[PDB]
Design an enzyme around this catalytic site. Structure first.
Site, PDB file in Angstrom:
ATOM      1  N   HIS A  99     -10.400   7.159   2.014  1.00 46.67           N
ATOM      2  CA  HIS A  99      -9.045   7.080   1.450  1.00 46.67           C
ATOM      3  C   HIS A  99      -8.953   5.984   0.414  1.00 46.67           C
ATOM      4  O   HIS A  99      -9.798   5.113   0.367  1.00 46.67           O
ATOM      5  CB  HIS A  99      -8.044   6.822   2.564  1.00 46.67           C
ATOM      6  CG  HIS A  99      -8.274   5.518   3.263  1.00 46.67           C
ATOM      7  ND1 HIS A  99      -9.188   5.376   4.248  1.00 46.67           N
ATOM      8  CD2 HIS A  99      -7.720   4.265   3.054  1.00 46.67           C
ATOM      9  CE1 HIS A  99      -9.196   4.105   4.672  1.00 46.67           C
ATOM     10  NE2 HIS A  99      -8.297   3.421   3.937  1.00 46.67           N
ATOM     11  N   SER A 109     -15.958   0.808   5.596  1.00 51.97           N
ATOM     12  CA  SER A 109     -14.940   1.213   6.557  1.00 51.97           C
ATOM     13  C   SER A 109     -14.778   2.721   6.693  1.00 51.97           C
ATOM     14  O   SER A 109     -14.051   3.181   7.571  1.00 51.97           O
ATOM     15  CB  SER A 109     -13.593   0.547   6.274  1.00 51.97           C
ATOM     16  OG  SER A 109     -12.934   1.135   5.164  1.00 51.97           O
ATOM     17  N   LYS A 130      -6.891  -4.936  -3.004  1.00 53.34           N
ATOM     18  CA  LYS A 130      -7.756  -5.444  -1.972  1.00 53.34           C
ATOM     19  C   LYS A 130      -8.755  -4.347  -1.575  1.00 53.34           C
ATOM     20  O   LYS A 130      -8.601  -3.192  -1.957  1.00 53.34           O
ATOM     21  CB  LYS A 130      -6.903  -5.863  -0.784  1.00 53.34           C
ATOM     22  CG  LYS A 130      -6.108  -4.724  -0.146  1.00 53.34           C
ATOM     23  CD  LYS A 130      -5.023  -5.294   0.750  1.00 53.34           C
ATOM     24  CE  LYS A 130      -4.174  -4.206   1.367  1.00 53.34           C
ATOM     25  NZ  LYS A 130      -4.966  -3.531   2.423  1.00 53.34           N
ATOM     26  N   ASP A 169       0.790  -1.244   0.000  1.00 55.97           N
ATOM     27  CA  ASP A 169       0.000   0.000   0.000  1.00 55.97           C
ATOM     28  C   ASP A 169       0.823   1.296   0.000  1.00 55.97           C
ATOM     29  O   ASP A 169       0.536   2.220   0.756  1.00 55.97           O
ATOM     30  CB  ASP A 169      -1.032  -0.005   1.147  1.00 55.97           C
ATOM     31  CG  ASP A 169      -2.102  -1.091   0.978  1.00 55.97           C
ATOM     32  OD1 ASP A 169      -1.997  -1.940   0.064  1.00 55.97           O
ATOM     33  OD2 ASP A 169      -3.081  -1.103   1.751  1.00 55.97           O
ATOM     34  N   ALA A 199       0.377   0.314   6.419  1.00 63.47           N
ATOM     35  CA  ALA A 199       0.831   0.780   7.717  1.00 63.47           C
ATOM     36  C   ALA A 199       1.361  -0.435   8.476  1.00 63.47           C
ATOM     37  O   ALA A 199       0.801  -1.529   8.357  1.00 63.47           O
ATOM     38  CB  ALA A 199      -0.344   1.397   8.464  1.00 63.47           C
ATOM     39  N   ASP A 238      -4.863  -0.622  -1.664  1.00 70.99           N
ATOM     40  CA  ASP A 238      -6.239  -0.492  -1.244  1.00 70.99           C
ATOM     41  C   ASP A 238      -6.986   0.110  -2.399  1.00 70.99           C
ATOM     42  O   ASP A 238      -6.526   1.066  -3.006  1.00 70.99           O
ATOM     43  CB  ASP A 238      -6.357   0.420  -0.048  1.00 70.99           C
ATOM     44  CG  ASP A 238      -6.464  -0.328   1.238  1.00 70.99           C
ATOM     45  OD1 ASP A 238      -6.153  -1.533   1.274  1.00 70.99           O
ATOM     46  OD2 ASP A 238      -6.878   0.299   2.234  1.00 70.99           O
ATOM     47  N   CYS A 259      -2.102  -3.120   7.402  1.00 72.04           N
ATOM     48  CA  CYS A 259      -1.949  -3.944   6.197  1.00 72.04           C
ATOM     49  C   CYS A 259      -0.646  -4.742   6.219  1.00 72.04           C
ATOM     50  O   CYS A 259      -0.629  -5.890   5.776  1.00 72.04           O
ATOM     51  CB  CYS A 259      -2.174  -3.202   4.871  1.00 72.04           C
ATOM     52  SG  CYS A 259      -3.591  -2.129   4.873  1.00 72.04           S
ATOM     53  N   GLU A 310     -13.936  -5.034   5.725  1.00 73.95           N
ATOM     54  CA  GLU A 310     -12.545  -4.594   5.819  1.00 73.95           C
ATOM     55  C   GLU A 310     -11.619  -5.658   5.228  1.00 73.95           C
ATOM     56  O   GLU A 310     -11.967  -6.837   5.120  1.00 73.95           O
ATOM     57  CB  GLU A 310     -12.153  -4.223   7.256  1.00 73.95           C
ATOM     58  CG  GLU A 310     -10.775  -3.566   7.416  1.00 73.95           C
ATOM     59  CD  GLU A 310     -10.565  -2.275   6.605  1.00 73.95           C
ATOM     60  OE1 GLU A 310     -10.432  -2.353   5.359  1.00 73.95           O
ATOM     61  OE2 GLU A 310     -10.494  -1.186   7.232  1.00 73.95           O
ATOM     62  N   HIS A 345     -10.714   1.035  -2.813  1.00 76.34           N
ATOM     63  CA  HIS A 345     -12.046   1.146  -2.212  1.00 76.34           C
ATOM     64  C   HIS A 345     -13.073   1.861  -3.050  1.00 76.34           C
ATOM     65  O   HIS A 345     -12.759   2.833  -3.749  1.00 76.34           O
ATOM     66  CB  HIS A 345     -11.961   1.918  -0.913  1.00 76.34           C
ATOM     67  CG  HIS A 345     -11.146   1.256   0.160  1.00 76.34           C
ATOM     68  ND1 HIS A 345     -11.320  -0.024   0.517  1.00 76.34           N
ATOM     69  CD2 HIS A 345     -10.186   1.776   1.018  1.00 76.34           C
ATOM     70  CE1 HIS A 345     -10.489  -0.326   1.530  1.00 76.34           C
ATOM     71  NE2 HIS A 345      -9.796   0.778   1.839  1.00 76.34           N
TER      72      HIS A 345
HETATM   73 ZN   LIG Z   1      -8.170   0.800   3.942  1.00 76.31          ZN
END
Ligand SMILES: [Zn+2]
Ligand SMILES: [Mg+2]
Length: 216
Positions: free
Chosen positions: A94, A59, A122, A8, A163, A51, A167, A129, A53
Site C-alpha cells: 500500500h 513491511s 514517512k 495519511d 489509522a 506514507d 499512524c 516501519e 513506500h
Molecule cells: Zn504503512
C-alpha cells in the site's frame, strides 16, 4: 500556536478501491476538509502526512518468503551493532510512491495544492516501519516535522486522520514526547480494526501519555 496534522488521508487507506481500506474512512474526507478551512479553529499551520513506500518495503508481506499479509514479524533495528527487535504486522502492499494509492484523497490534495500546505512523507526507507510522522519506530531517522512545527511557533498540535491505532496514535505520542500540548479529535479519525473496542483502548493509551482526546 496551533498546528493541525492530517494523518495519511491517502487512497489506499480511504477508498474502497484502496489496498488497505480503513472501514468508514470515506466518512472523514468532507469533515476533515471542512476542518482544514474553518477559521474558528485558528490553525496557524496545517501539515498533511503521507506514507511513501518503495515497493520493496520490509513491511509488505509480499517481500517475505512464506509470510502472508496481516502476519506477525520480528523487525530488527537497522543501526549496526544494535540488535533489539520489535513485533510488527506485515501488510498488503500500500501507499507505494507515485501510485494512485499513495495520493492524498482528491478533496484533501486539492486543498494542499491550492493552499501550498506542508507535506511530510514517512516510510520511504525500505528497512523499517514508520508509523509516526515525526520519526521511525526506532527513533533513528526523523522527518522534518518537528523542525517545521518549531519554525512556525507551534505549542499545540491537533491530530486527525487514519489509522487511529497506528499512524494517528504514533504521531500523537511523538508530539507529546516532544513537549507539544497534543489533542486527538476522535471524530475525525477511524481505526483500521472494525472492532469498537479498539477505540477505547487507544483512548486510554493516549490519555496515559497526557494527550487530550476530545470528539470534535
Ligand atoms: Zn504503512
Ligand atoms: Mg480495499
Amino acid at each position: 500556536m496551533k498546528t493541525l496534522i492530517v494523518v495519511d488521508m491517502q487512497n489506499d487507506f480511504i477508498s474502497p478501491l484502496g489496498s488497505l481500506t480503513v472501514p468508514k474512512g470515506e466518512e472523514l474526507i468532507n469533515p476533515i476538509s471542512d476542518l482544514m478551512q474553518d477559521a474558528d479553529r485558528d490553525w496557524h499551520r496545517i501539515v498533511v502526512t503521507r506514507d511513501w513506500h518503495p515497493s520493496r518495503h520490509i513491511s509488505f508481506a509480499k517481500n517475505h518468503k512464506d509470510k502472508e499479509p496481516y502476519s506477525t514479524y520480528t523487525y530488527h533495528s537497522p543501526r549496526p551493532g544494535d540488535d533489539s527487535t520489535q513485533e510488527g504486522i506485515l501488510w498488503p502492499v500500500h501507499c507505494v510512491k507515485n501510485t494512485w494509492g499513495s495520493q492524498l484523497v482528491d478533496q484533501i490534495m486539492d486543498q494542499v495544492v491550492t493552499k501550498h500546505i506542508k507535506i511530510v512523507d514517512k516510510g520511504f526507507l525500505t528497512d523499517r516501519e514508520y508509523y509516526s510522522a515525526f520519526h521511525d519506530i526506532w527513533n533513528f531517522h526523523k522527518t522534518d516535522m518537528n523542525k517545521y512545527l518549531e519554525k512556525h511557533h507551534t505549542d499545540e498540535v491537533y491530530i486527525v486522520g487514519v489509522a487511529l491505532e497506528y499512524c494517528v496514535k504514533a504521531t500523537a505520542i511523538s508530539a507529546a514526547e516532544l513537549g507539544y500540548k497534543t489533542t486527538v479529535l476522535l471524530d475525525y479519525t477511524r481505526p483500521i480494526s472494525d472492532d469498537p473496542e479498539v477505540i477505547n483502548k487507544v483512548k486510554e493509551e493516549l490519555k496515559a501519555h497526557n494527550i487530550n482526546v476530545v470528539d470534535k
